[PDB]
Design a protein around this nucleic acid. Structure first.
Lengths: 88, 50, 29, 81, 183, 21, 463, 105, 96
RNA sequence: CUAGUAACGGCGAGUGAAGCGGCAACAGCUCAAAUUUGAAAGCUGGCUUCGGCCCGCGUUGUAAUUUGGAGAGGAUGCUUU
């Protein structure tokens, strides 16, 4: 509509109000490795190790309720499997 | 399925060489204590007032 | 075998590449 | 090991309130009428975990009977890493 | 940092160690009474973020409440029911807050943070003299706690048009026939 | 009153002023 | 012709007089007038000719005339290859704008991203930056650049050699082009330089060619000495070296200005009579100290290699390179010649870590003779206890050590010859112990199968 | 209604709109499906239908405007749940090219 | 003439005074208020403590007037204040 | 005021808001998340010659700093009690 010159605003500190810090990443991973896995998480781990990626994805979707959450959980479990393989 | 399996230290197997926080150390950790300075001053006030 | 003296030593696929309608890279899975 | 650690820890036990106030009064009277950093054992869950995270700790001792046990579950692992 | 680690445990509360701890503590809670006193909280991180303070006058009470249907569902949450039972138990204290601590196939378990209004440390602390004020008598009974606000829909947006300012007050305001002098 | 609020009211108090017509 | 006869602003003239430069140099003499006229210029000057001042004078004068303020954004952009040259240019620019009101800023890789973002949001008129980090900031962070008027590209041949062709062309296409002065200094004139110039400058460039064409590259008349020192005994070996060959002229080259500052201050505490030369100092008294070192009998100069490029090294006994060399080829030839130094037998030695032994095969393929040194272990003056005590008891030493450490790490990361000087073979524990720490302080060392059915993008706007 | 009518199909609901269309493609790959019928509701008032040949096949977007479902009591018709229908295509689906594509999909 | 087109240059007359504002036929009340505003006020100059005076005196006695040396000293200067801090404290005290 | 509009409804009876705009009044803040760590600096009670002495709480965390259109830490030079 009207022609007005747009300004450049300062970056709000409320951006990224979730977590992205390396310290919280460390804490979260350490708590993962001290606490372990849930029954369904371990089931999906077994499925991924056996190679039934489709079955693991379906089970994760059934347990969680959302495709994005299922994909994400498969992702953390996959890097956990890879990290365990490297550690061994 | 083994019900109760041995834990694999996938994350803690790697020792981290460096501290987590990069926040600079404040001066109070290398200068004497102003808290005790103020306490000593208050005690001196009390002694002067008797 | 550093050929040139003071330079650095020079140093799985799922899509097939084809040409699309608009002359761009089309990806066959 | 417990006894030797307790010996060193006792040689570095923190100052009690009586002698702390006594030394404060010492300093006040000295002001009326030169030191180095105090080295003492550090205590407190949050303080010690931060010290470990900053790698300022040389040795860590953990109570075996913390009745919320979650307060400690992560501490041996973080010390190890 | 320890509270952050505890928060991560509470996030992954379905893990092995947390499941074991909640199992043992559930057995202990079943063995104890329906309502009992804790000097120290079971989840200190949750208590601290809800406002529990290591002061003379702050107490935790752990309470078990029957879960399930009342097909008419009881509109008051089990958390609110536990807080109300705590209020009738110790009417002298003020309900600061409450948090879920455990659950079973018959009982759900909550821990409530309570504040003593007659202790002069609480009177002096200017962050808690607000609950020392007499307006906050039986907040659990008037639905002024977090569960009360959640059940009353005290939120902003078009999703909460009917309840953002009080359901009954909004009904009355919309159904009053206002007649001015110069009509 | 809290220490922070005490310092704030000490250093930035309510000023007494007037706006000219 | 001097800066006085060239008619500039009174603030600029006072700044120049305070710095001390009176006679204009070659480039400073026949480049500033065309630049203040406004004609885009390509030059081939070599480092040490004062090109920094030669291109800062027009930018500062233009900002003063246009009356720029921090809220208007960037008016002048400096594109530099390495962060050490960035800091040198920053020191010079601070010297120039000491009396002005427009602000100067630095944006370099391996630095606090959020701090630089806040800096840009607040606003800088003259900004010196590195290619990759500059381009990232332009692509991602909110700041004003629509009033840009001057762009200097310093040592574009170095920039292309490092490999920022894509970064530089994206910078050129992103930054505004209309009513923009373009100055480009680059010694060697290659095909990459031709391309960068043809995209960057306007149809009519003025070209300056007095590059020193008598490059006496000595291929055989050189002998390079090297000492294979462990990471955690580097500073101790340097200290023992300095003690033993006191009463001899010594020049030691470091990598970064913060490292120079920390070593200077630490040696002052540990009783080393030393003449120092680093960026934070004043230009006038830097000249005074250089004159004193040239006209002294003994003494040791702590200076960096990038400054030694501009410095004209007098007759000295020992040329030591403690930190890895910024330029290997230029380093070898130039400083070997300046070390062996005409008549008097001069010796030039380089510190090599055990992870850095590929430089030997490098030199062998380069066809130059080398000599190794022994440093008997009992002659190493172990004072690391006093070092750690002072680092732990003095806060100013704690800072100077932390900036020195991080600057060394980031320089080693953004070192050109990665095959020999790759950071991932370093031990941070031992390098921190050599700096005097017990625990290495936080420094970020960093600083397929795509989706099923994922076709590329013919439309849509992302920012 | 279409799920009842289509017996080689699988029903699924609540796909996040913040996700991606090729993420719909991995969804179809997970379900081993070579065709996808996407229902996108805009304004909660207007229907958008996507017919896509999953792996690398051309996709068609239509907008659904006027809606009448099987549960209305003015239809007075009923058939077998999954029996084969007589596909009665119009002539424009036989001449016109984009209608050729729509007919094939 | 504004080469860089911003109305803020027209409107103008990075640190500002923050505890006060520097300001540049009418009713009797208004003039009385104006006189009251423009009346000078007592300075009430803040001064320094006896021990601070003694510490500065000893530091001057030992290191003369070398700000670098006084910052360098440890025993007489436990609180590792900056040389500029020491210089302004000395200036406020009065002795160089 | 929007307004008996949108929207919902044995689409019959009927039900039925909200943004915006003009007003009245207008005031912003406290926490959890940090190591005071060169010093629990915090608080309850009873004993008082009422001035300062103990006991206990508490490190499983009480004071000061900080709460995301922020902040911290240094340097820096102005200005307030």
């Amino acid at each position: 509509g009207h022609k007005t010159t747009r300004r450049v605003l300062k970056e709000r500190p409320s951006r990224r109000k979730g977590a992205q810090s390396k310290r919280t990443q460390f804490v979260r991973s350490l708590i993962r490795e001290v606490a372990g896995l849930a029954p369904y998480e371990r089931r999906v781990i077994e499925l991924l190790r056996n190679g039934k990626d489709k079955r693991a994805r379906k089970f994760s979707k059934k347990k969680l309720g959302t495709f994005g959450r299922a994909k994400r959980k498969c992702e953390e479990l996959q890097r956990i499997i890879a990290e365990s393989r490297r550690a061994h | 399925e083994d019900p109760y399996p041995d834990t694999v230290e996938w994350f803690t197997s790697v020792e981290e060489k460096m501290p987590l926080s990069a926040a600079p150390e404040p001066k109070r950790r290398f200068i004497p204590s102003k808290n005790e300075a103020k306490q000593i001053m208050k005690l001196v006030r009390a002694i002067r007032e008797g | 075998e550093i050929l040139e003296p003071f330079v650095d030593p020079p140093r799985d696929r799922n899509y097939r590449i084809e040409k699309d309608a608009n002359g761009g890279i089309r990806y066959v899975y | 090991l417990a006894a030797q650690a307790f010996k060193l820890l006792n040689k570095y036990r923190p100052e009690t309130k009586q002698e702390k106030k006594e030394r404060l009064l010492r300093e006040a009277t000295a002001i009326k009428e030169v030191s180095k950093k105090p080295y003492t054992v550090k205590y407190g869950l949050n303080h010690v975990v931060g010290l470990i995270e900053n790698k300022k700790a040389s040795l860590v001792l953990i109570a075996n009977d913390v009745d919320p046990i979650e307060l400690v579950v992560f501490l041996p692992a973080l010390c190890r890493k | 940092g320890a509270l952050k680690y505890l928060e991560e445990l509470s996030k992954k509360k379905q893990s092995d160690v947390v499941r074991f701890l909640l199992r043992v503590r559930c057995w202990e809670y079943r063995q104890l009474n329906v309502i009992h006193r804790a000097s120290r909280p079971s989840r200190p991180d949750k208590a601290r973020r809800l406002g529990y303070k290591a002061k003379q006058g702050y107490v935790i009470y752990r309470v078990r409440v029957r879960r399930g249907g009342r097909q008419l569902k009881y509109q008051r949450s089990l958390r609110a029911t536990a807080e109300e039972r705590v209020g009738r138990r110790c009417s002298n204290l003020r309900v600061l807050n409450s948090y879920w601590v455990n659950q079973d196939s018959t009982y759900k378990y909550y821990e409530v943070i309570l504040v003593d209004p007659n202790h002069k440390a609480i009177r002096r602390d200017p962050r808690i003299n607000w609950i020392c004020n007499p307006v906050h008598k039986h907040r659990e009974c008037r639905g002024l706690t977090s569960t009360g606000k959640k059940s009353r829909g005290l939120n902003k947006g078009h999703r909460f048009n009917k309840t953002r300012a009080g359901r009954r007050k909004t009904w009355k305001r919309h159904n009053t026939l206002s007649l001015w002098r110069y009509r | 009153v809290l220490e922070k609020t005490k310092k704030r009211l000490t250093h930035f108090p309510q000023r007494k002023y007037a706006v000219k017509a | 012709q001097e800066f006085s006869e060239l008619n500039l602003s009174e603030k600029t003239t006072k700044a120049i007089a305070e710095m001390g430069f009176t006679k204009m140099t070659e480039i400073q003499r026949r480049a500033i007038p065309p630049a203040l006229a406004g004609k885009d210029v390509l030059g081939a000057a070599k480092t040490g000719s004062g090109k920094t001042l030669a291109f800062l004078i027009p930018a500062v004068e233009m900002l003063s005339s246009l009356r720029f303020k921090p809220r208007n954004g960037t008016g002048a952009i400096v594109v530099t290859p390495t962060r050490e040259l960035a800091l040198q240019i920053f020191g010079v620019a601070r010297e120039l704008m000491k009396y002005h009101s427009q602000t100067y800023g630095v944006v370099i890789g391996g630095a606090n991203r959020r701090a630089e973002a806040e800096k840009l949001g607040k606003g800088v008129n003259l900004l010196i930056a590195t290619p990759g980090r500059l381009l990232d900031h332009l692509q991602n962070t909110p700041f004003v650049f629509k009033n840009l008027k001057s762009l200097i590209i310093d040592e574009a041949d170095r920039i292309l050699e490092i490999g920022f062709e894509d970064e530089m062309r994206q910078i050129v296409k992103i930054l505004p082009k209309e009513d923009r002065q373009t100055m480009l200094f680059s010694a060697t004139q290659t095909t990459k330089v031709e391309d960068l110039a043809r995209i960057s400058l306007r149809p009519g460039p003025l070209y300056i060619n007095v590059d020193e064409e008598k490059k006496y590259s000595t291929v055989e008349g050189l002998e390079q000495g090297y000492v294979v020192v462990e990471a955690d005994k580097r500073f101790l070996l340097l200290f023992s070296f300095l003690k033993k060959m006191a009463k001899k002229k010594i020049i030691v080259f470091f990598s970064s200005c913060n490292s120079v500052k920390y070593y200077s201050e630490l040696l002052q505490y540990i009783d080393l009579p030393v003449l120092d030369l680093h960026g934070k100092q004043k230009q006038q008294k830097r000249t005074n100290t250089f004159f004193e070192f040239c006209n002294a009998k003994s003494g040791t100069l702590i200076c960096t290699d990038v400054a030694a490029r501009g410095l004209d090294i007098p007759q000295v006994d020992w040329i030591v390179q403690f930190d890895p060399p910024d330029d290997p080829r230029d380093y070898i030839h130039r400083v070997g010649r300046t070390a062996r130094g005409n008549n008097g037998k001069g010796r030039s030695l380089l510190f090599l870590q055990p992870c850095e032994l590929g430089f030997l095969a490098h030199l062998k393929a380069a066809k130059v003779p080398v000599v190794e040194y022994d440093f008997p272990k009992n002659k190493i003056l172990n004072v690391q206890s006093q070092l750690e005590k002072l680092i732990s008891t003095n806060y100013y030493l704690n800072q100077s050590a932390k900036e020195g450490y991080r600057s060394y790490i980031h320089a080693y990361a953004s070192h050109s010859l990665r095959s020999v000087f790759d950071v991932h073979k370093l031990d941070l524990v031992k390098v921190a112990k050599s700096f005097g720490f017990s625990t290495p302080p936080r420094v970020d060392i960093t600083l397929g199968r795509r989706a099923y059915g994922s076709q590329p993008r013919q439309g849509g706007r992302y920012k | 209604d279409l799920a009842s009518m289509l017996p080689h199909g699988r029903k699924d609901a609540k796909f996040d709109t913040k996700s991606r269309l090729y993420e719909l493609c991995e969804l179809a790959e997970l379900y081993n499906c070579n065709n996808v019928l996407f229902f996108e509701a805009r304004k909660g008032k207007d229907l958008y239908m996507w017919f896509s040949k999953v792996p690398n096949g051309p996709t068609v977007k239509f907008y659904a405007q006027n809606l009448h479902t099987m549960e209305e009591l003015h239809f007075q018709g009923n058939c077998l749940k999954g029996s084969r229908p007589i596909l009665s295509f119009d002539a424009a689906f036989e001449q016109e090219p984009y209608l050729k594509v729509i007919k094939e999909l | 003439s504004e080469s860089d087109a911003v109305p803020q240059q027209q409107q103008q007359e990075n640190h500002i005074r923050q505890h006060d504002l520097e300001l540049e036929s009418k009713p009797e009340v208004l003039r009385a208020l104006e006189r009251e505003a423009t009346r000078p006020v007592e300075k009430t100059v803040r001064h320094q403590s006896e021990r601070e005076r003694e510490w500065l005196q000893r530091l001057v006695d030992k290191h003369g007037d070398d700000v670098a040396a006084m910052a360098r000293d440890r025993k007489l200067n436990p609180y590792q204040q900056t040389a500029s801090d020491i210089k302004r404290r000395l200036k406020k005290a009065g002795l160089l």
